[PDB]
Amino acid sequence: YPTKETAHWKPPPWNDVDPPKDTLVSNLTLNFGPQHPAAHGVLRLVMELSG
Amino acid sequence: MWFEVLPGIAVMGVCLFIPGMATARIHRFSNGGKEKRVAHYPYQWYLMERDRRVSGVNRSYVSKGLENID
Amino acid sequence: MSMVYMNIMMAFTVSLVGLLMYRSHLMSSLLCLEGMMLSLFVMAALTILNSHFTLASMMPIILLVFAACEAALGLSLLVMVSNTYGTDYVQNLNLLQC
Amino acid sequence: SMMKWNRERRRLQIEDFEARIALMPLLQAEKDRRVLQMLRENLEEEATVMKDVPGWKVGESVFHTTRWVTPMMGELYGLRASEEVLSATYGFIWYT
Amino acid sequence: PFFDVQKRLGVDLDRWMTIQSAEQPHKIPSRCHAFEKEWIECAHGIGSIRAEKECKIEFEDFRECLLRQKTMKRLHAIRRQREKLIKEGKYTPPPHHSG
Amino acid sequence: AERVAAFLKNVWAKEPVLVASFAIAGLAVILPTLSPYTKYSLMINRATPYNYPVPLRDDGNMPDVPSHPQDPQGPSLEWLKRL
Amino acid sequence: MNLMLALLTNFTLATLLVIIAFWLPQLNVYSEKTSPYECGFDPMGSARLPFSMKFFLVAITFLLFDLEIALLLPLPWASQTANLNTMLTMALFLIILLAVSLAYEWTQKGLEWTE
Amino acid sequence: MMLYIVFILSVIFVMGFVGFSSKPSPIYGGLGLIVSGGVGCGIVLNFGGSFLGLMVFLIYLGGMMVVFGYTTAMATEQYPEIWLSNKAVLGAFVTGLLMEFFMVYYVLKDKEVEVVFEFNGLGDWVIYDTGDSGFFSEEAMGIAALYSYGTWLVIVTGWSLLIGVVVIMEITRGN
Amino acid sequence: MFMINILMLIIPILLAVAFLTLVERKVLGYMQLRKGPNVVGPYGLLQPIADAIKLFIKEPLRPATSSASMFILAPIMALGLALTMWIPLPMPYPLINMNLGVLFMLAMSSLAVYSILWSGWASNSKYALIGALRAVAQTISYEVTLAIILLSVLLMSGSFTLSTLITTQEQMWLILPAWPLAMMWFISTLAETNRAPFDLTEGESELVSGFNVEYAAGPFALFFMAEYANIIMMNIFTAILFLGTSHNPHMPELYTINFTIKSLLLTMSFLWIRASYPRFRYDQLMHLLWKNFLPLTLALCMWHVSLPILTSGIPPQT
Amino acid sequence: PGIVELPSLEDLKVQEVKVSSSVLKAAAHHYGAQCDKPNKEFMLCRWEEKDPRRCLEEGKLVNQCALEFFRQIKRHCAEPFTEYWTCIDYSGLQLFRRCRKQQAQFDECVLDKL
Amino acid sequence: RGEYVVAKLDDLINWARRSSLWPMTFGLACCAVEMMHMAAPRYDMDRFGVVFRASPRQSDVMIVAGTLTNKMAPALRKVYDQMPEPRYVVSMGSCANGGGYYHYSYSVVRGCDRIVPVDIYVPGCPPTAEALLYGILQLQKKIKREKRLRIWYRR
Ligand SMILES: COC1=C(OC)C(=O)C(C/C=C(\C)CC/C=C(/C)CC/C=C(/C)CC/C=C(/C)CC/C=C(/C)CC/C=C(/C)CC/C=C(/C)CC/C=C(/C)CC/C=C(\C)CCC=C(C)C)=C(C)C1=O
Ligand SMILES: CCCCCCCCCCCCCCCCCC(=O)OC[C@H](COP(=O)(O)OCCN)OC(=O)CCCCCCCCCCCCCCCCC
Ligand SMILES: CCCCCCCCCCCC(=O)OC[C@H](COP(=O)(O)OCC[N+](C)(C)C)OC(=O)CCCCCCCCCCC
Ligand code: SF4
């Protein structure tokens, strides 16, 4: 029984599997140096970290 | 030399000795020269609250011997 | 029914009302489930300890054991929700329509 | 060594418990009089406080049975000072 | 129980903790042991329909022991009356009730 | 007996912590069922008098119940004083 | 009374030390001084961003094992019972099942952190 | 007065509940549940159960430590909400304290209050038992009976914890 | 006289912590072929006094991005809880005599973790956050092992009372019957105190300063004071647990001298270890205690439940 | 319903045993050997009657026999007993272990003189 | 007298600050190698109370040991700014003093004193470990002669 509310409803996938969402992995960027004991003084190591 | 490290250990040792000594001596002073009564279970607490009443001065560490029965 | 039972029973009601009114985070609602278990533990422990119901003294412990299972189970589902949408928002959990 | 000393510790415990078992008849007899004395003192004082209340019956029981019911803390220390009520209620739990 | 496997098999799975007047470690009694025992023995084998009316006296005493509603009301009246008399200087507390 | 010895040596060379764990746990399960002293642990616990020994009303027909604590009747703890 | 007074003294001393720290010294506050520290260069993003937990499975398992200490800690009192045969059986059964849980997760690569 | 310590702890117990029930950032909600766990331990500990009070505090201290790690991984945003940053959070926080105030105000004034049940305001100390136990802790003897009396409880809880580990691995496998 | 007893506990503790910093710098110095503090005072005896004054007259800063109430609550909680773990310790008489003292210390040690988590989170800094989440991993690593190691020992003592451990070791130290448990316990106190080789919450060479990277002046000193008061306490706990001292009720001072020496030596071993070993990776610390200590602790827990039963050596309940 | 019946203060009047807990514990073993019959009589009354009001008379004979017990110690073993319970009184736990030498002196006096 | 008291308080805080100097763990170039040898056993800067700490928020002294380039200059100012006061800067070596061997380079800052204030200049290329230690003990004497409280007392 179509209504205004259910006009944009569409039948679910034939196998219950929805498409995976667009990659939104947010890696953490960290300045490892230069003022860092293990950076040997003048190294600015920009690291993408996951955990 | 290494024995120049000892003065810093002696001061540290004296500081660790005081807490134990102070508690031991303060308990004696607060319980008439005896160990503070240990009451881990109600029976021991029941006897300590009976000591207060028997003492007649509201102190559980004041003992009453055979001189108080006649 | 002393004045302590009022606050304990009010704590359960607050955590129940807190669980039934979601804001956004699934984690915020999981805390309300663990809050409700805490109220039930305290209320049961008080009644058992006051009535000297000796054997019932283990019931509050058995109540915490199964509160952890639910809490761990709720966290495991929260991991999979986060892995699918990048957040623990409950508004994303709407693919299934009543 | 550990199991030989623990075995000796169990015998020292039985001796300690038998010392209590020797005193319990004396302690129980004293406690019974102490509880009955306190209840009577509350009854002799409920009479004066509640002399004017219309329907009050001094010493009325809340139970249908005539069996002896162990008084709870409120009944026994109903009218006594807060100092002794504090020690009779939380004295043990707070003694550390 | 919906299925009474315990009763037939003769195995006691959870009956040992159902009541507070049952056997306890070191024979430690519950505060309302006598009241529960009386209500249980009065209402044994007669069904809850009859016990709800024929064992009403024992069950009301049992509830009084459990929650102490009537005792606390009685204490409240005595305490409230004493304050009224004292507030209007009409009653002197005795020594053993003060120290 | 040759192939089994190979398994034990292999684990003893690669997981010595686990070999000690299972060996320790195996002794915990086996020795109590064999020790002759396990029965005394039960008796010592039963011999510890937490509660008061409520006396029995004497109807005149209880020959095995003592009238005084120091009477020969009743359980004896002579075994415990030597254990 | 003693325990509560001991706690009040410890956290009162802790508080008074903090108060002195903020009111005794000479302060010169300006924007660059209180900016977040990232080794000299401005942080690239917010510290409040998600931080992936690679040991999430082991952290959930900690919740279940942390409840075994609640069940195991009564053992010293449990050993005082007259039912030693039953008590020792259920003590070992409970510990063994705790060990089988560890074995299952270990063998199924559950204790290995995610890549 | 110290005679109302249990009641005073139960007021903080509710205030902590309003802390996380208003649902701010789970970081601050976790703090609220720790305060309630701490005072809840105090309340139980004053009725004669020291093991139960210390145990629930111990379990919830580890419980919220895992929750803290999960909050920085999966329940965090750029501006974590405090009890003042949001009208919905602030509205529910002020409402909870006001109801606590009125219930506390009426119980301490009338010595009674009727909400579903009838509560008595004389003080929690009036219901304590006047007899002493023996040479043991009744709470400790009851908890130690789990292994001699609670054979069936040990099996079901033991099996539940075992299956709990199997289940969480299955749920989080992802394939 | 009870307030005087409290002050006669915390004040000497704060003095011992102050001079443990001197003792560590000189012991590390001589194990590194140098001297350490010897200029400020005779043999460096005034170095702790100079450091305390310097830190408390220095400017403390609240970072612009910090959560102030939690940022300032954390140092207060750390020092308040490090002083609270001394009140049940029998030396030989506890200030607060608890029937469940072992449980109380466990509960307080789990609550003191949040002085790290809230410190690191409230700072709103990436290195403070990485440091805070290393404390979550560390606690997940040792908590289960630590509690069951205590339980195994308490099955030979028979109670959770700390003063009972004195009676248990009246004939012999518990190091002999429980040397395997003493080894794991010692390592677990290193992990629990965030000490090298398990100093990961700070991890100087990796996280600059870890959870307290943003702390300055007095607030930093409170974290440092809490850190050093814990290692002394965790070694007093070890001496009571495994190196029991004889208690003569007429000479309670002899216990204190002998008990103090063992605590100093165990504390010196912490400094000895910090000079000798590298640092674990914090995922390697988790595998150390879950794959090696936990399998052994579970086995030893079963062994110590059965050994008293099969030898008729169950300790008394009271 | 009904009035709770209580004894008068004259029915509860009796000569108390005013000795501290250390005195009682020092003499407990001998006390339980000599005063068994009045003790066990009173203790049977409490468990059978279940009412402290029904065992007041038995509860007085417990007091009467305990006094006579200490009077006999006060006549023959006054000095050894005082040393014994002074040493038990010193310990916080009132341990028997630490007073064996003083216990022996108290045990031998009663054995010979009583 | 009030002047006497503030003089003694000044001697106390001045003593505490010069006896507990905590340099930031901050080195740029070859001059940091000579700074390592001042921490090595022969000179043992730790015995004077001088302890390195990595966090700028726990440091009292910045030793600019090496060359300062235009790329690094913003980083240096940031870490200097994040030092709680009182804070002192020691410039070590020709590069950090006035550019040294690289004075005329497109990418070198001609002296760290263009970026931060400097309290002591230690000459050399590199200064020997014993020459840096002279500058540290010269900084301590400079702190010993501060008159913070006396100047406050007569404002
Ligand atoms: C070769 O290539 C290159 C590198 O590659 C290596 C580089 O790297 C770099 C970059 C260089 C740098 C960043 C500088 C390098 C310089 C060095 C000196 C590093 C070399 C190696 C070292 C080992 C130096 C020092 C490091 C360590 C680990 C030594 C260990 C000894 C110590 C004393 C450190 C700290 C130890 C302890 C025990 C604690 C002392 C700490 C304190 C803060 C003092 C006490 C604390 C308190 C809080 C006060 C106490 C009292 C209180 C709080 C009050 C209590 C009392 C009351 C009453 C309240 C360059 C340019 C380079 O070219
Ligand atoms: C009566 C009650 C007491 C009995 C309780 C019953 C439960 C007992 C088990 C409880 C402990 C749970 C763990 C048991 C399983 C052992 C762990 C396991 O699953 O190992 C599987 C192992 C996987 O490793 P894999 O990747 O394949 O690489 C090595 C290959 N060789 O693959 C393998 O290769 C393993 C090979 C077989 C290992 C056998 C282990 C037997 C353990 C029990 C021995 C106990 C007796 C020993 C002590 C004797 C007494 C001193
Ligand atoms: C908790 C509540 C805190 C209250 C405030 C406390 C800090 C401020 C107190 C200053 C009082 C005052 O007036 O001292 C100042 C007076 C002289 O005053 P003046 O020259 O007229 O100052 C007018 C303003 N000038 C100075 C800018 C022109 O110098 C003195 O004689 C002593 C000053 C040093 C402090 C002495 C205390 C020593 C303690 C030692 C601890 C180890
Ligand atoms: S001053 Fe000399 S030693 Fe120092 S960085 Fe420059 S070139 Fe290298």
Helix (H, G, I), strand (E, B) or coil at K120: strand
Does the N-terminal peptide bond of residue K56 adopt cis geometry, omega within 30 degrees of 0? no
* Mutation to test the G interface, candidates I59, I150, I294, most G Cβ within 10 Å: I59
* Residue C80 main-chain phi, psi, to 5 deg: -70, -35
Q: Is the torsion defined by CA of I42, I48, I53, I54 positive or negative?
A: positive
Q: Identify the bridge partners of residue I185 per DSSP, sorted by sequence position.
A: none
Binding site, annotated residues of K for [4Fe-4S] cluster: 30-31, 95, 125
Helices F38-47 and I294-311: crossing angle, nearest 10°? 70
Long-range contacts of G112-115 (CB under 8 A, 24+ apart): G113/G54, G113/G55, G113/G58, G113/I283, G114/G54, G114/G56, G114/G57, G115/G54
How many folded domains does chain G comprise? 1
Q: Which amino acid is at K101?
A: Y
Separation of CA E29 from chain center:
13
For residue A48, give the H/E element and its range: strand A45-49
Binding site, annotated residues of K: 30-31, 95, 125
- With CA atoms as reference, report the closest residue to I250 among D37, G90, H147, J91: J91
Domain-located, residue G112:
no
Query: Are K58 and I216 a contacting pair, CB within 8 Å?
Result: yes
Tokens of residue I95, six digits = 């200030």
Chain B residue with minimal CA distance to D20? Answer: B43
K94 CA: nearest ligand 4 atom: 1
The 10 Å CB-count burial string (b at 16+, else e) for D10-23 is bbebbebbbbbbbb
Q: What does the longest C-alpha to C-alpha distance in chain H come to? A: 62
Pairing between strand H117-120 and H112-115? antiparallel
* Mutation to test the F interface, candidates I310, I311, I317, I318, most F Cβ within 10 Å: I310
Give the Å distances, CA to CA, from H132 to C57, H49, H136.
18, 15, 10
Resolution (A): 2.5
**How many residue contacts between C and H have a Cβ separation below 8 Å?**
216
* Residue C89 main-chain phi, psi, to 5 deg: -70, 140
- With CA atoms as reference, report the closest residue to K115 among B68, G2, G32: G32
Q: Where are the beta strands (DSSP E) in chain B?
A: none
Q: Which residues have C-beta within 8 Å of that of residue I10, sequence separation ≥ 6?
A: G9, G10, G13, I83, I86
- With CA atoms as reference, report the closest residue to C75 among I133, I286, G63: G63
Q: Which amino acid is at E36?
A: E
Tokens of residue I74, six digits = 């954390």
Distance separating alpha carbons of residues G84 and F37, to the nearest angstrom: 12
G107 CA: nearest ligand 2 atom: 23
Query: Are I110 and H54 a contacting pair, CB within 8 Å?
Result: no
Helix (H, G, I), strand (E, B) or coil at A28: strand
B17 touches chain H (CB under 8 A): no
- With CA atoms as reference, report the closest residue to H44 among C33, C61, I112, G54: C61
The 10 Å CB-count burial string (b at 16+, else e) for J57-86 is ebbbbbbebbbebbeebbeebeebbbbbbb
Query: Are B18 and I12 a contacting pair, CB within 8 Å?
Result: yes
Do I204 and K48 make contact, defined as CB atoms within 8 angstroms? Answer: no
Q: What does the longest C-alpha to C-alpha distance in chain K come to? A: 59
Residue written as token pair 């690593």: I141
Do F57 and J47 make contact, defined as CB atoms within 8 angstroms? Answer: no
G1 touches chain D (CB under 8 A): yes
Q: Which residues have C-beta within 8 Å of that of residue H76, sequence separation ≥ 6?
A: G48, G49, G50, G51, H25
Is K23 touching ligand 4 by the criterion CB < 6 Å? no
Q: Which residues have C-beta within 8 Å of that of residue G9, sequence separation ≥ 6?
A: I3, I6, I7, I10
Distance separating alpha carbons of residues B65 and J18, to the nearest angstrom: 8
- With CA atoms as reference, report the closest residue to G88 among C61, K123, F38: F38
Q: Which amino acid is at D95?
A: Y
Helices I114-122 and I126-157: crossing angle, nearest 10°? 180
Q: Which amino acid is at K111?
A: G
Q: Where are the beta strands (DSSP E) in chain K?
A: 61-65, 88-92, 120-122
G5 touches chain D (CB under 8 A): no
- With CA atoms as reference, report the closest residue to C2 among H10, I102, G103: H10
Domain-located, residue H175:
no
- With CA atoms as reference, report the closest residue to E25 among C68, H133, H2: H133
Tokens of residue C85, six digits = 């949408």
For residue G97, give the H/E element and its range: helix G84-107
Residue written as token pair 């700390």: I162
How many helices (H) does chain E have, and how many strands (E)? 5, 0
D44 CB neighbour count, 10 Å cutoff? 14
Helix (H, G, I), strand (E, B) or coil at G46: coil
- With CA atoms as reference, report the closest residue to J20 among E42, B49, H48: B49
Distance separating alpha carbons of residues H15 and H12, to the nearest angstrom: 5
Residue nearest to atom 41 of ligand 2 (CA): F22
H128 touches chain B (CB under 8 A): no
Is G96 touching ligand 2 by the criterion CB < 6 Å? yes
Do D89 and H125 make contact, defined as CB atoms within 8 angstroms? Answer: yes
Tell me the CB-side half-sphere exposure of residue D80, using CA atoms within 13 A: 20
Distance separating alpha carbons of residues C14 and C8, to the nearest angstrom: 10
Residue nearest to atom 8 of ligand 4 (CA): K30
Q: Which residues have C-beta within 8 Å of that of residue B11, sequence separation ≥ 6?
A: I15, I19, I45
Q: Identify the bridge partners of residue K120 per DSSP, sorted by sequence position.
A: K90
Tokens of residue E42, six digits = 């009065």
Query: Are C14 and H96 a contacting pair, CB within 8 Å?
Result: yes
Distance separating alpha carbons of residues K152 and K155, to the nearest angstrom: 5
Torsion of CA H163, H164, H168, H169, to 10 degrees: -40
Does the N-terminal peptide bond of residue I197 adopt cis geometry, omega within 30 degrees of 0? yes
The boundaries of the domain holding residue G48 are 7-107
Domain-located, residue G2:
no
Separation of CA E66 from chain center:
3
Computed on alpha carbons and rounded to an integer, the radius of gyration of chain E in Å comes to 22
Task: Quickly list H helices, K92-128.
Answer: 93-98
Q: Identify the bridge partners of residue A29 per DSSP, sorted by sequence position.
A: A48
Distance separating alpha carbons of residues E83 and H112, to the nearest angstrom: 17
Is K6 touching ligand 3 by the criterion CB < 6 Å? yes
Closest CB from D76, D78, D90 relative to H46? D90
Q: Which chain C residues have a beta carbon less than 8 Å from that of H131? A: none
Tokens of residue I213, six digits = 């990277």
Q: Identify the bridge partners of residue D60 per DSSP, sorted by sequence position.
A: J3
Distance separating alpha carbons of residues H115 and H129, to the nearest angstrom: 27
DSSP E46: S
Query: Are I186 and I238 a contacting pair, CB within 8 Å?
Result: yes
Does the N-terminal peptide bond of residue C60 adopt cis geometry, omega within 30 degrees of 0? no
Tokens of residue I114, six digits = 């949040």
Q: Which amino acid is at A17?
A: V
Chain D residue with minimal CA distance to G6? Answer: D96
Helices D82-94 and B42-55: crossing angle, nearest 10°? 140
Q: Is the torsion defined by CA of E15, E20, E21, E23 positive or negative?
A: positive
Residue written as token pair 């503070």: B36
CATH number at residue G50: 1.20.58.1610
**J1: closest CA of chain F, how far (Å):** 33
Task: Quickly list H helices, D50-81.
Answer: 73-76
- With CA atoms as reference, report the closest residue to J30 among J91, J62, J59, J72: J72
- With CA atoms as reference, report the closest residue to I51 among B16, K60, G13: K60
Give the Å distances, CA to CA, from D64 to B14, D72, E64, E70.
68, 17, 10, 12
Angle CA J52–J57–J59, to nearest 5:
60
How many folded domains does chain H comprise? 1
Residue nearest to atom 4 of ligand 4 (CA): K31
Tokens of residue G92, six digits = 């070992």
Q: Which chain J residues have a beta carbon less than 8 Å from that of I249? A: 90-91, 98
Query: Are K13 and I57 a contacting pair, CB within 8 Å?
Result: yes
Is K101 touching ligand 4 by the criterion CB < 6 Å? yes
CA of G100 to the centre of ligand 2 (A): 10
User: In this structure, which CATH number among 1.10.3720.10, 2.40.110.10, 1.10.287.3510, 1.10.10.10 belongs to the domain C3-85?
Assistant: 1.10.287.3510
Does the N-terminal peptide bond of residue A34 adopt cis geometry, omega within 30 degrees of 0? yes
* Residue I15 main-chain phi, psi, to 5 deg: -75, -40
Domain-located, residue H174:
no
Long-range contacts of H53-57 (CB under 8 A, 24+ apart): H53/C45, H54/I100, H54/I103, H54/I104, H54/I107, H55/C61, H55/C64, H55/G70, H55/G73, H55/I103, H56/C38, H56/C41, H56/C42, H56/C45, H56/C60, H56/C64, H57/I107, H57/I111
Q: Is the torsion defined by CA of K5, K8, K14, K19 positive or negative?
A: negative
F70 touches chain J (CB under 8 A): yes
Tokens of residue D4, six digits = 């030989």
Distance separating alpha carbons of residues I178 and I184, to the nearest angstrom: 10
CA of I275 to the centre of ligand 1 (A): 13
Is F22 touching ligand 2 by the criterion CB < 6 Å? yes
Output the DSSP codes for chain J.
Answer: --B-----TTTT--------HHHHHHTHHHHHHHSHHHHHHHHHHHHHH--GGGGHHHHHHHHHHHHHHHHHHHHHSHHHHHHHHHHHHHSSS--SGGGHHHHHHHHHHHHHH-
DSSP G111: S
Give the Å distances, CA to CA, from I309 to C95, F58, I312.
59, 38, 5
Residue written as token pair 């503790």: I13
Query: Are H23 and H95 a contacting pair, CB within 8 Å?
Result: no
Query: Are D77 and D42 a contacting pair, CB within 8 Å?
Result: no
* Residue D47 main-chain phi, psi, to 5 deg: -65, -45
Q: Which chain H residues have a beta carbon less than 8 Å from that of B41? A: 133-137
Do G45 and A29 make contact, defined as CB atoms within 8 angstroms? Answer: yes
- With CA atoms as reference, report the closest residue to I294 among I207, I168, I202, I188: I188
K28 CA: nearest ligand 4 atom: 5
Burial class of I235 by CB neighbour count within 10 A (0 to 12, 13 to 18, 19+): buried
Angle CA B21–B25–B30, to nearest 5:
145
Distance separating alpha carbons of residues K45 and K92, to the nearest angstrom: 16
Domain-located, residue H57:
yes
Distance separating alpha carbons of residues F63 and F74, to the nearest angstrom: 10
CA of F14 to the centre of ligand 2 (A): 14
Distance separating alpha carbons of residues D81 and E82, to the nearest angstrom: 13
Domain-located, residue H129:
yes
CA of G105 to the centre of ligand 2 (A): 14
Distance separating alpha carbons of residues E13 and E22, to the nearest angstrom: 14
Tokens of residue I182, six digits = 């003493």
CA of K83 to the centre of ligand 4 (A): 25
Tokens of residue D73, six digits = 């803390």
The boundaries of the domain holding residue H82 are 4-169
Helix (H, G, I), strand (E, B) or coil at B49: helix
F24 CA: nearest ligand 2 atom: 51
- With CA atoms as reference, report the closest residue to I186 among I244, I235, I136, I137: I235
CA of K10 to the centre of ligand 2 (A): 72
CATH number at residue H23: 1.20.120.1200
Query: Are E69 and E53 a contacting pair, CB within 8 Å?
Result: no
G21 touches chain K (CB under 8 A): no
Method: cryo-EM
H88 CB neighbour count, 10 Å cutoff? 12
DSSP I314: P
Is K31 touching ligand 4 by the criterion CB < 6 Å? yes
Torsion of CA H7, H11, H17, H23, to 10 degrees: 180
Distance separating alpha carbons of residues J81 and J22, to the nearest angstrom: 11
Tell me the CB-side half-sphere exposure of residue G78, using CA atoms within 13 A: 29
CA of J60 to the centre of ligand 1 (A): 78
Output the DSSP codes for G10-34.
Answer: HHHHHHHHHHHHHHSS-----GGGG
